[PDB]
Structure formats: structure tokens, C-alpha cells
Design an enzyme around this catalytic site. Structure first.
Site, PDB file in Angstrom:
ATOM      1  N   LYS A 110      -3.905  -4.416  12.220  1.00 61.75           N
ATOM      2  CA  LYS A 110      -3.746  -5.856  11.881  1.00 61.75           C
ATOM      3  C   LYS A 110      -2.426  -6.449  12.616  1.00 61.75           C
ATOM      4  O   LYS A 110      -2.428  -7.683  12.963  1.00 61.75           O
ATOM      5  CB  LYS A 110      -3.787  -6.161  10.368  1.00 61.75           C
ATOM      6  CG  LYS A 110      -5.030  -5.674   9.812  1.00 61.75           C
ATOM      7  CD  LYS A 110      -4.909  -5.889   8.120  1.00 61.75           C
ATOM      8  CE  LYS A 110      -4.008  -4.943   7.545  1.00 61.75           C
ATOM      9  NZ  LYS A 110      -4.324  -3.786   7.643  1.00 61.75           N
ATOM     10  N   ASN A 133       1.545 -11.548   6.120  1.00 56.28           N
ATOM     11  CA  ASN A 133       2.184 -10.083   5.786  1.00 56.28           C
ATOM     12  C   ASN A 133       3.238 -10.111   4.872  1.00 56.28           C
ATOM     13  O   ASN A 133       3.642 -11.318   4.566  1.00 56.28           O
ATOM     14  CB  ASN A 133       2.573  -9.358   7.022  1.00 56.28           C
ATOM     15  CG  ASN A 133       3.388 -10.026   8.082  1.00 56.28           C
ATOM     16  OD1 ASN A 133       2.805 -11.022   8.435  1.00 56.28           O
ATOM     17  ND2 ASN A 133       4.679  -9.891   8.023  1.00 56.28           N
ATOM     18  N   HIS A 178      -6.869   2.475   0.812  1.00 58.73           N
ATOM     19  CA  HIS A 178      -6.870   1.443  -0.457  1.00 58.73           C
ATOM     20  C   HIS A 178      -7.870   1.625  -1.306  1.00 58.73           C
ATOM     21  O   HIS A 178      -8.278   0.842  -2.061  1.00 58.73           O
ATOM     22  CB  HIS A 178      -6.858   0.107   0.315  1.00 58.73           C
ATOM     23  CG  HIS A 178      -5.716  -0.112   1.171  1.00 58.73           C
ATOM     24  ND1 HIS A 178      -4.468   0.013   0.789  1.00 58.73           N
ATOM     25  CD2 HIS A 178      -5.770  -0.505   2.204  1.00 58.73           C
ATOM     26  CE1 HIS A 178      -3.572  -0.288   1.717  1.00 58.73           C
ATOM     27  NE2 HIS A 178      -4.410  -0.579   2.620  1.00 58.73           N
TER      28      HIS A 178
HETATM   29  N1  LIG Z   1      -7.581  -0.079  16.868  1.00 49.17           N
HETATM   30  C1  LIG Z   1      -6.684   0.944  15.960  1.00 49.17           C
HETATM   31  N2  LIG Z   1      -7.748   2.073  15.408  1.00 49.17           N
HETATM   32  C2  LIG Z   1      -6.980   2.879  14.702  1.00 49.17           C
HETATM   33  N3  LIG Z   1      -5.384   3.268  14.741  1.00 49.17           N
HETATM   34  C3  LIG Z   1      -4.953   2.012  15.378  1.00 49.17           C
HETATM   35  C4  LIG Z   1      -5.508   1.142  15.998  1.00 49.17           C
HETATM   36  N4  LIG Z   1      -4.366   0.387  16.461  1.00 49.17           N
HETATM   37  C5  LIG Z   1      -3.476   0.810  16.250  1.00 49.17           C
HETATM   38  N5  LIG Z   1      -3.494   1.986  15.405  1.00 49.17           N
HETATM   39  C6  LIG Z   1      -2.767   2.770  14.536  1.00 49.17           C
HETATM   40  O1  LIG Z   1      -2.797   2.239  13.135  1.00 49.17           O
HETATM   41  C7  LIG Z   1      -1.475   2.237  12.536  1.00 49.17           C
HETATM   42  C8  LIG Z   1      -1.101   1.004  11.894  1.00 49.17           C
HETATM   43  O2  LIG Z   1      -1.039  -0.027  13.063  1.00 49.17           O
HETATM   44  P1  LIG Z   1      -0.697  -1.496  12.787  1.00 49.17           P
HETATM   45  O3  LIG Z   1      -0.775  -2.403  13.908  1.00 49.17           O
HETATM   46  O4  LIG Z   1       0.674  -1.553  12.157  1.00 49.17           O
HETATM   47  O5  LIG Z   1      -1.549  -1.736  11.826  1.00 49.17           O
HETATM   48  P2  LIG Z   1      -1.879  -2.516  10.303  1.00 49.17           P
HETATM   49  O6  LIG Z   1      -0.894  -3.855  10.170  1.00 49.17           O
HETATM   50  O7  LIG Z   1      -3.375  -2.683  10.146  1.00 49.17           O
HETATM   51  O8  LIG Z   1      -1.307  -1.550   9.104  1.00 49.17           O
HETATM   52  C9  LIG Z   1      -0.630   2.986  13.500  1.00 49.17           C
HETATM   53  O9  LIG Z   1      -0.474   4.355  13.440  1.00 49.17           O
HETATM   54  C10 LIG Z   1      -1.117   2.540  14.879  1.00 49.17           C
HETATM   55  O10 LIG Z   1      -0.679   3.496  15.997  1.00 49.17           O
HETATM   56 CA   LIG Z   2       0.332  -4.983   8.463  1.00 49.64          CA
HETATM   57 MG   LIG Z   3      -3.275  -1.307   4.819  1.00 51.52          MG
END
Ligand SMILES: Nc1ncnc2c1ncn2[C@@H]1O[C@H](COP(=O)(O)OP(=O)(O)O)[C@@H](O)[C@H]1O
Ligand SMILES: [Ca+2]
Ligand SMILES: [Mg+2]
Ligand SMILES: [Cl-]
Length: 442
Positions: A110, A133, A178
Site C-alpha cells: 500500500k 496512513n 489482521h
Molecule cells: N506486491 C507485493 N506483494 C508482496 N509483498 C510486497 C509487495 N510489495 C512490497 N512487498 C513487501 O511487503 C512489505 C510491506 O511493504 P509496504 O509497501 O510497506 O506495504 P504496506 O504499506 O501495505 O504495509 C515489505 O516487506 C515489502 O517488501
Molecule cells: Ca502502510
Molecule cells: Mg497492514
């Protein structure tokens, strides 16, 4: 009538102040004794702190519920049974503005996707405001009178949001997370899919069954995926020699090797952003320039340093199994031709997750897993036999063991698949400590 803000914190302060400015009678209640933001509320706002005030909540015309408080709480259930509206600050934002909203949710990616499409919009000339966020409360986005909103929305925020009427909406992906709040994947998916209520356009992930929504036949839909796309869809095309391109239909757009963000999951993140941008009219030439420069976010499978021809990666924000699966697969595939393998640091608070989905990727790409944290025994039970397993009592010992186990062309990956609070203050603390450990290796 009376607006009762349930739960203070950053978004609760935002809601109290917004409602007061718009001329509403606002009370606020919170269970914590002196809640964060006590000093940031206008005097004259009635406050009932120390106990989630059930009587005050039943006095409400509408309750503005913090995303940190479950609607399933008994005090909130008593209000819903009386017929009292329970909404969140996103609902207040929706009522306050008519500007187009780009709405983004998903189990992972996200913040990465929200940041990137926000940058694409800004670079294309849009007066865009980006938030939703923690620390970017949505109501504060109205201050600078943006023409376009890009909202990162959690499943908790979406649970209390109705008729979002997004200009374009996406559920990027779903995996186990979650469930302490939502109970099961059923409840979790239903919450995220509220993002499609009234959606004018939909983007969805062809490769994730839990992404595609059920919307009316008149609602335009466009998909991304990691295969050759159909006409007017996003995907990947390979040259005859294997070179991988981001693509739309038959048109090749940009080489994946020309991106700073790496791994097929980041290719998918980039494709999702192109589809979101197309839905709001951004030109392709501009979007690709933004994409070429985008570096990715801190602690998202992030390169730290090379020590003795071994690259070290900080994926401390890989706090769930789905994120860690992406990290292992991405690095593993990247080093396969040079015959490298992954040394993986796994563990922490496992949250009752199913770690089974890691086994096949550990078996394929990892030469060792070093387990840390309080659920190391449960994780060990799940991954036993997939590769060599070691234990470490500290992060520093785990990094040192991974260094010993690796040779030139291997990589070392901190991707815990777990929350950090048994040993660290936060995933940020865990990642900073990992970087310090890597920098002290000889
Ligand atoms: N498309 C994706 N599918 C799975 N994991 C992902 C993807 N894109 C990023 N990640 C991983 O997911 C984790 C959270 O990424 P992030 O962009 O901060 O997501 P969020 O804001 O949804 O928590 C990190 O470990 C990242 O490397
Ligand atoms: Ca986030
Ligand atoms: Mg989350
Ligand atoms: Cl964490």
C-alpha cells in the site's frame, strides 16, 4: 446532533478539530487515562477519558470510531444496536470534498504504491494530496485545496467507510494479516472490498483471486499481472532473448532492469501504478519518467551494503508471510544464474500465521535459515527439512551466522515474516539495528 469521537490519537485529534471548526457539538472518549493528543484538543470539547464512555456513546447522533478500536467492541455494539451511526474519519473526508479520490488498499505494497502513484500524479502536473496512513490524517489533506486525493486505506479504515465513490480503486493483493481483528479471511476480504462501493473505475490483480471485485457491468475494469497482457491490460513481455519489459497489451513500456525497484512483486507494483495513473489520465511518458527515478521505501527489501561480495538486504517491514515470500522469491530468482543462494533471517512474533507458504521458496532459494525471536520454535516446526536451520539469540549473532554461511554471489536477507515487538521497539528499530550490524561486519 452530538458527535462523539471514540479513540483519540492522531486521527482522533484530526476529527475533533475538523468537527469543531465546522460548527458541530463534539465530545471525545478514550479508554487510556491521559490519551495522546490531550494537549492538542480545543478547550470546551467535552472529554470522557479513562473509560470508553458507554453512556456518552449512547448519547451520540454519530460516533467517529478510531481505526484502532474494533466495531466489535461491546460499547460500540451497544451503540449500533441503538441505531447510532458509526463511521470513521475517511467518511468525514468523503462528505467534505467532491474531488476525485484514488483509493488504494491491499495486504502489502500500500505505502509503496501510494507513494509512487502520488509521485506520478505530482510529476504530471496534478495538484495532488497524498495521505490516509498513520501520521497523514485524511482530513488534514483538505487544507491545501488539492484537485486530487490519493488515499492509502487500511482494512480497519475501510470497515467503517461507505459509498467511498472513488474515481479509481484497487485491492493490490491479499494475504494473511489482521485476523486478530477481522477473525478470518472472510471478514478481512469483506472489509477491504468496501473500497469499491460506488467506484467509478477498478484496477485489479489478475494473479490474486482476492483482488478482483464484484461490481456492476457498467464499471470499467483494467487488470495488471505478471504475464503477457490481453488488449488494453498491463503485464510483462519478454524479448526473444528473455529481456523482460513492463507492457500494456502488445506495447513494451520499460525494461524491468531499468527500474531501481527490483523483484517481480515490484514489477507488479509498478504496473498497478501505471493502471491507476491511466484511470486518472496521466500520460504514459510522464509516468515512466517518475518510475525510472523511484527508489522504493526504507526497510522494504532494501539493499544495505556489499560485504565480501555478498549483498545484504533489510526487509524489516516484511512483517507477514506474504511479504517475506515475495522477498525470498525476488532475491532468489535474481541470483539463480550466478548460482547464488539466500541466507534468510526469520522470526519474531508470528501472530499465529501459517508459515507453510514459505517452505517451497526456502527449499528452492535458501541455503540457510537463521531463526530469531519468540516464535522461532513454531516457525522451526513449520519449515523443518526445507533447508539448513540455525538459531540465534540476538540479531547481531544472526547476521554473523549468515555472513559465515555465505560466499560471493549469495545474499543475506532480513525478512522476519513477523512483528518485532518481542525484541525491538518497531520494525524501524529492527531494520536500523540490522543496518548497524551489517556495517560492523569485517
Ligand atoms: N506486491 C507485493 N506483494 C508482496 N509483498 C510486497 C509487495 N510489495 C512490497 N512487498 C513487501 O511487503 C512489505 C510491506 O511493504 P509496504 O509497501 O510497506 O506495504 P504496506 O504499506 O501495505 O504495509 C515489505 O516487506 C515489502 O517488501
Ligand atoms: Ca502502510
Ligand atoms: Mg497492514
Ligand atoms: Cl513490527
Amino acid at each position: 446532533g452530538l458527535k462523539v469521537v471514540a479513540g483519540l490519537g492522531i486521527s482522533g485529534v484530526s476529527a475533533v478539530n475538523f468537527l469543531h471548526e465546522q460548527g458541530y457539538q463534539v465530545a471525545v472518549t478514550d479508554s487510556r487515562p491521559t490519551p495522546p493528543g490531550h494537549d492538542q484538543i480545543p478547550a470546551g470539547v467535552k472529554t470522557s477519558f479513562g473509560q470508553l464512555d458507554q453512556e456518552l456513546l449512547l448519547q451520540a447522533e454519530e460516533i467517529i470510531l478510531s481505526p484502532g478500536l474494533a466495531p466489535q467492541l461491546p460499547e460500540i455494539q451497544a451503540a449500533i444496536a441503538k441505531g447510532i451511526s458509526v463511521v470513521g474519519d475517511i467518511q468525514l473526508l468523503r462528505r467534505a470534498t467532491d474531488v476525485p479520490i484514488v483509493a488504494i488498499t491491499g495486504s502489502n505494497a500500500k505505502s509503496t504504491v501510494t507513494t509512487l502513484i502520488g509521485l506520478m500524479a505530482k510529476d504530471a502536473g496534478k495538484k495532488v494530496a497524498v495521505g490516509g496512513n498513520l501520521g497523514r490524517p485524511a482530513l488534514d489533506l483538505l487544507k491545501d485545496q488539492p484537485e486530487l486525493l490519493v488515499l492509502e486505506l487500511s482494512s480497519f479504515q475501510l470497515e467503517t467507510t461507505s459509498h467511498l465513490n472513488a474515481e479509481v480503486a484497487v485491492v493490490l493483493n491479499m494475504s494473511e494479516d489482521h485476523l486478530d481483528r477481522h477473525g478470518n479471511m472472510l471478514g478481512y476480504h469483506q472489509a477491504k472490498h468496501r473500497i469499491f462501493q460506488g467506484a467509478k473505475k477498478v484496477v485489479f490483480n489478475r494473479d490474486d483471486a482476492l483482488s478482483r471485485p464484484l461490481v456492476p457491468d457498467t464499471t470499467p475494469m483494467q487488470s495488471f499481472g505478471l504475464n503477457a497482457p490481453d488488449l488494453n491490460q498491463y503485464g510483462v513481455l519478454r524479448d526473444a532473448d528473455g529481456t523482460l519489459w513492463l507492457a500494456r497489451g502488445l506495447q513494451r513500456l520499460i525494461k524491468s532492469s531499468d527500474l531501481y525497484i527490483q523483484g517481480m512483486h515490484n514489477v507488479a507494483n509498478a504496473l498497478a501504478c501505471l493502471a491507476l495513473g491511466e484511470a486518472i489520465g496521466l500520460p504514459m511518458e510522464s509516468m515512466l519518467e517518475t518510475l525510472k527515478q523511484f527508489k522504493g521505501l526504507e526497510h522494504r527489501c532494501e539493499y544495505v551494503k556489499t560485504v565480501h561480495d555478498v549483498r545484504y538486504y533489510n526487509d524489516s517491514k516484511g512483517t507477514n508471510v506474504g511479504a517475506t515470500l515475495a522477498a525470498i522469491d525476488g532475491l532468489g530468482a535474481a541470483i539463480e544464474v550466478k548460482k547464488g543462494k539466500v541466507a534468510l533471517i526469520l522470526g519474531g512474533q508470528g501472530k499465529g500465521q501459517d508459515f507453510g507458504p514459505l517452505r517451497s521458496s526456502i527449499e528452492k532459494y535458501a541455503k540457510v535459515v537463521v531463526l530469531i525471536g519468540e516464535d522461532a520454535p513454531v516457525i522451526e516446526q513449520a519449515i523443518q527439512g526445507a533447508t539448513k536451520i540455525l538459531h540465534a539469540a540476538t540479531l547481531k549473532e544472526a547476521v554473523e551466522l549468515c555472513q559465515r554461511e555465505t560466499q560471493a554471489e549469495d545474499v543475506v536477507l532480513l525478512s522476519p515474516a513477523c512483528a518485532s515487538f518481542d525484541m525491538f521497539k518497531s520494525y524501524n528499530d529492527r531494520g536500523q539495528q540490522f543496518v548497524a550490524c551489517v556495517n560492523s561486519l569485517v
